[PDB]
Amino acid sequence: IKELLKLGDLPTSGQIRLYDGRTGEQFERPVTVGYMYMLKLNHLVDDKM
Amino acid sequence: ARVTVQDAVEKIGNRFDLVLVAARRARQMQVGGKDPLVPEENDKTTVIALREIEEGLINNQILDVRERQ
Amino acid sequence: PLVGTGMERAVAVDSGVTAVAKRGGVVQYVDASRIVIKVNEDEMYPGEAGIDIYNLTKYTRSNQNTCINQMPCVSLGEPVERGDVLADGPSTDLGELALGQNMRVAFMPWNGYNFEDSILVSERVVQEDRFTTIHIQELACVSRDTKLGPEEITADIPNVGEAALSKLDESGIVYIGAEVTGGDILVGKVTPKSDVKDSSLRVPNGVSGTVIDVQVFTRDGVEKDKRA
Amino acid sequence: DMIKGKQGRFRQNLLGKRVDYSGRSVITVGPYLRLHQCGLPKKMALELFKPFIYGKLELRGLATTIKAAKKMVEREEAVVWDILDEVIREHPVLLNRAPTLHRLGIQAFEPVLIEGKAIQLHPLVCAAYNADFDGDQMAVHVPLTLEAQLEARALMMSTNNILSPANGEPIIVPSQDVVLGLYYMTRDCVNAKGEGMVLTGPKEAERLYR
Amino acid sequence: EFLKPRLVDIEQVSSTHAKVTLEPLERGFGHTLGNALRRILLSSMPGCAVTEVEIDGVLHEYSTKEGVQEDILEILLNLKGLAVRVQGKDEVILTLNKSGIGPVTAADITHDGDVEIVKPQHVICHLTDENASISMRIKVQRGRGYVPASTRIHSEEDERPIGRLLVDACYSPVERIAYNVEAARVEQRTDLDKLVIEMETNGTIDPEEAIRRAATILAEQLEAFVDLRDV
Amino acid sequence: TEFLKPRLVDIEQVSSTHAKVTLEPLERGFGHTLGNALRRILLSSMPGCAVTEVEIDGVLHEYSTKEGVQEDILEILLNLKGLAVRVQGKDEVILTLNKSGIGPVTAADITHDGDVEIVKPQHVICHLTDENASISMRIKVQRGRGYVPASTRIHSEEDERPIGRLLVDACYSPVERIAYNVEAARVEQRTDLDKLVIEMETNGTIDPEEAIRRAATILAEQLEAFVDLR
RNA sequence: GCGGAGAGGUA
Ligand SMILES: Nc1ccn([C@@H]2O[C@H](COP(=O)(O)CP(=O)(O)OP(=O)(O)O)[C@@H](O)[C@H]2O)c(=O)n1
Ligand SMILES: [Mg+2]
């Protein structure tokens, strides 16, 4: 995974520095970002409510 | 909103008949037989009665004397 | 999945949701309802061969009221071999299982909007319209034979305003493609007494969508039913 | 068989009824809330408080008769939302989570009308409810009578129950993000920016940090 | 006693991607202006987008045409991405008429004066039959932000024609905004900063106009601040 | 196109230096952009006057002790940081304090100059003990923007100075505290709108309302070059 | 179209 991240020109540690969209200030201690495969389950609030 | 009733329970330490006296007062207030003794700030009659209790104007004995009067 | 396990193709193919070629050939016609393939001479039967036709299934109701739609993968003139994936089933892409979608996540607490296992999402996700699913409810109106007289499906419905009829045809059934909301009259029915009362089916409260299909099943086999 | 047994009677229909003026929905974080309030969907609130809405509509004269009040609620015009805001003002609702293990499984809150179909639950009270925002649902009941209102606001409201009835310790303790943030904020480091400078108070400390 | 920023060179790397520089920024205002503009741009930039579509042989979003391979719903999804520039009017009616085998791209739209199709190569549909013909009439509006169909349903306003196909409106041209405050060596000064705003848009709003309008909006809100009643 | 302007400026001025300011209704997302822009400008870039450097006639280093003052030197520096002074014409002026006798040497005890006004005459500086009670100092106040800590100047102290010149952190910006909350507010049909509550504490000199005023003013002058739709 | 069986799922 480290090698593949390097080939893409991304931080090898898999964490990036992120800026707060509201304040614009940087977060201390960079955070893990990346793409994860998420699912929407059949439990829909409009069905539940 | 009145977030704590701690002073009203400090007035009557049972913390249960507090609810009864406040219910009697707020029921005299809703069905318009009586009038509030405190300037309302767009509260409903429950929180009005609690606000009146915490200020020391109303209790069970004041209710009894005013009713017989 | 950007990060899968390789089993996606096995699951998608082995499930019956994809349309898979039985005899390899060349794609002769591609439509969003059917894929017609001219078979290769190798696999071509000598006597009475013809071509292969794959009818696709477009938005139908699954057991759970989800949508079951197949999309074509291939284009005109592409060669296909036996066992390739012609059309994508529900939640499958080019033969692979695509259960959900892969989005850019960041692990951090963001002013306690992801406090517990709850999740924070960017309006861009809704803008790109990527977690919007199509569901499909089925409703049934049944006209039986009572001993006081058979009920009727006519559009003449007691004490309903013409507003409710506007979207109904002369037979009393909604037009395909009409947008409805809770309480609108799906079909017109009269209870015999003869009328003055309506047993007409209405959209359930608080559900609103487009009528995509209507079906009519008649034991009587009446000569003149419009929807039929 | 009808009398005896769980499913039959006393347990089922005489200690376990099924009330009116009640709803259910998924719970959500809502950090901005005060300890004594809960986010309640507009549409659910309207449905619950329907008869209150009718009463208030008739008092103001916006509707001549009760059927006109029903029709006005079923159209949902701006006046209806204004009346809903006015009636909801001090009316408290009861929030309950399916396994009501102890008496803190039911608590009263003042609702704040919000968009959406999910109920917003104050984070601090989750520990009392054993609530988690991973698909947990909660039911919401409306106390009707005047006596019920006083009981909900005095005895049952969330802010009145901070200590557990079991042991004396607090129930509303910060759970995970709060404690992590506070921990991060208070821990010190040997060397950083602004090492060893003398501040006249906390106010300039925030001036410096921000 | 202040300095003030003047808009300087606006590099255009691509038709959609642009870099805008602001040279004489006081210390500390680099980030302030960067973030304020980023917010205004991403949130409030007015653009035009398709709101609804009428195709001939199709009753509802879920049906299908002969001789096309996209479903009608996918055709709408492709149209949502259509990048268009409207100049004078607020609501324009574009007409797409194509026949024969081939990919129906945005270029095939009937060329009107006031409307500019920014990306003519943008695909819409694919025909697959010699005698298959698709015709549609796309209604394009001007707006700000993001408005879905379901919200506008309150304001239906005689949606009676079943041929009407509502599309979600992304009334926003700006796709991405980044900024860097970097040391702006001015020939007679020690510590001055320059703001460099790199922006990626669908190619309808021009950079100069985007930045000017964003600054305008922020300035108007500041005007709201200048007076304080206290009455 | 047509935007939504804030319709109200509710201002709750408890304790004149402390002002809460409410603003509604504001377009979605503008709460934080506008609140933060104002906050940052107020905090980091705000013209003010403050004590920069000090010379004590008696002590050479910040850890030494003066006889008869119970307060340590650091306490005196902290008291000098709190002095909120507004000078009219001069850019940098040097005030003198000379006191004897028992009691609290307060800001009023400074020599009264023409153009310089000390907004809090009762601000305590030092406590002097009995029978010796000798305090003499020269405090230099300068005009500047924002907050400038001692450490960054003492870094650049290659201009070697004679001993006893003790540097102090310069609190130029008049704002002592600033914070903003954004919360939901709806105009009867539109719910995705927000309210801005700005809690502000200033150091006496200017009242918070007018501080906010000149903050928004400054940002508008910077913005002026682009804004032309009028 | 109140009910009750069977199956599955949620917390
Ligand atoms: N069959 C079941 C399963 C669950 N429940 C209830 O649903 C909740 C799930 O807890 P949980 O264990 O899933 C999460 P939590 O308890 O907060 O610990 P964690 O977050 O650190 O993982 C609990 O309150 C259970 O009482 C139930 O009544 N019947
Ligand atoms: Mg849970």
Question: Does the nearest atom of strand G lie within 7 Å of A43's Cβ?
Answer: yes
Q: Which of residues 185-214 of F touch E (CB under 8 A)?
A: 209, 212-213
The residue type of E151 is T
Q: Which nucleotide is nearest to D99 (CA to C1')?
A: G11
Resolution (A): 3.2
Alpha-carbon span A47 to C108, nearest angstrom: 30
Cis peptide before E120 (omega within 30 of 0): no
**Are the beta carbons of E115 and E171 closer than 8 angstroms?**
no
Q: Enumerate the residues of chain E whose CB falls inside 8 A of the CB of residue A23.
A: 35
Alpha-carbon span C50 to C47, nearest angstrom: 9
CB atoms within 10 A of CB F75: 16
Touching A (3+ Cβ pairs <8 A), the chains are C, D, E, F
Query: Which parts of E11-114 fold into alpha helices (H)?
Result: 29-44, 72-80
The residue type of F120 is K
Nearest to E33, CA basis, from E25, E23, E44 = E25
| Residue C190, burial from CB neighbour count under 10 angstroms (0-12, 13-18, 19+) | buried
DSSP string, F138-165: EEEEEEEESEE-HHHHHHTTTS---TTE
D179's enclosing H/E stretch is: helix D177-186
The residue type of C126 is V
Ligand 1 center to A48 CA (angstroms)? 19
Nearest to F86, CA basis, from F220, F202, F221, F201 = F202
The residue type of C11 is V
The three-class DSSP label of residue D150 is helix
Query: What is the CATH class of F47-171?
Result: mainly beta
Tokens of D92: 């408290």
Phi-psi region of F179 (alpha: psi -120 to 50; beta: other; left: phi over 0): beta
Q: Straight-line distance from CA C141 to C1' G1, in Å?
A: 13
The shortest C-alpha distance from A24 to chain E (Å) reads: 6
D22-28 vs D119-120, strand pairing mode: parallel
Query: What is the CATH class of E46-171?
Result: mainly beta
Residues with CB under 6 A from ligand 1: D 99, 130, 132
User: Looking at the complex, does the CB of residue A38 fall below 8 Å from at least one CB of chain D?
Assistant: no
User: Looking at the complex, does the CB of residue F149 fall below 8 Å from at least one CB of chain E?
Assistant: no
Question: Does the nearest atom of strand G lie within 7 Å of D100's Cβ?
Answer: no
Q: Straight-line distance from CA F223 to C1' G2, in Å?
A: 71
Ligand 2 center to D110 CA (angstroms)? 23
The shortest C-alpha distance from A25 to chain C (Å) reads: 14
**Are the beta carbons of C105 and A36 closer than 8 angstroms?**
yes
G11 C1': nearest CA residue? D136
Alpha-carbon span E35 to F212, nearest angstrom: 19
Alpha-carbon span E124 to E71, nearest angstrom: 11
The shortest C-alpha distance from E181 to chain F (Å) reads: 15
User: Looking at the complex, does the CB of residue F158 fall below 8 Å from at least one CB of chain E?
Assistant: no
Cβ contact A38–C102 (<8 Å): yes
The three-class DSSP label of residue F13 is coil
- CA-nearest residue, atom 23 of ligand 1: D130
**Are the beta carbons of D165 and D159 closer than 8 angstroms?**
no
Please state the atom number of ligand 1 nearest to the C-alpha of residue D132: 17
Tokens of C187: 């079909």
Cβ contact D29–C112 (<8 Å): yes
Nearest to F140, CA basis, from F98, F89, F85 = F85
Touching C (3+ Cβ pairs <8 A), the chains are A, D, E
Nearest to C100, CA basis, from C125, C83, C117 = C125
The shortest C-alpha distance from F36 to chain A (Å) reads: 6
Domain B5-68, what architecture? Answer: Alpha-Beta Complex (3.90)
The residue type of F41 is I
**Are the beta carbons of B2 and D152 closer than 8 angstroms?**
no
CA distances for D121 relative to D37, D39, D49, E3, F105, angstroms: 8, 7, 20, 49, 55
Interface of E with A (CB under 8 A): 31, 34-35, 38-39
Tokens of A44: 């829909």
Q: Straight-line distance from CA D138 to C1' G11, in Å?
A: 10
Which ligand neighbours the alpha carbon of D135 most closely?
Answer: 2
CA quadruple C8, C10, C11, C12: dihedral sign? positive
Beta bridge partners of E13: none
DSSP string, F46-102: -EEEEEEEEEESS-SSTT---TTBSS-HHHHHHHHHT--EE-SS-SEEEEEEEE-SS
CA C51 from centroid of its chain's CA atoms: 28
**Are the beta carbons of D165 and D103 closer than 8 angstroms?**
yes
Question: Does the nearest atom of strand G lie within 7 Å of D99's Cβ?
Answer: yes
Dihedral angle over CA of E151, E153, E155, E159, nearest 10:
150
Method: cryo-EM
Site of tokens 């207030």: B29
Question: In the 120-159 stretch of chain D, whose C-beta falls under 7 Å of nucleic acid strand G?
Answer: 132, 134-137
Alpha-carbon span E107 to F165, nearest angstrom: 76
Alpha-carbon span D135 to D28, nearest angstrom: 9
Question: In the 22-41 stretch of chain A, whose C-beta falls under 7 Å of nucleic acid strand G?
Answer: none
N-term to C-term CA, chain D: 70
Cβ contact E34–A24 (<8 Å): yes
Biggest alpha carbon–alpha carbon distance for chain A: 48
Alpha-carbon span B17 to C34, nearest angstrom: 77
**Are the beta carbons of F105 and F76 closer than 8 angstroms?**
no
Q: Straight-line distance from CA C141 to C1' G4, in Å?
A: 25
The three-class DSSP label of residue B36 is coil
F49-69: buried (b, 16+ CB within 10 Å) or exposed (e) per residue? bbbbbbbbeebeebeeebeeb
The three-class DSSP label of residue C55 is strand
Alpha-carbon span C171 to C184, nearest angstrom: 16
CA distances for E146 relative to E67, E170, F153, angstroms: 33, 5, 50
Indicate the angle between helix axes E29-44 and E207-226, nearest 10 degrees.
110
DSSP string, E8-35: EEEEESSSSEEEEEEEEEPTTHHHHHHH
Nearest to D52, CA basis, from D145, D154, D148, D156 = D145
Tokens of C194: 């003869």
DSSP string, C129-197: TTT---B---------EETTEE-B--S--TT--HHHHTTB-TTSBBPTT-B--TT-BSB--B-----S-
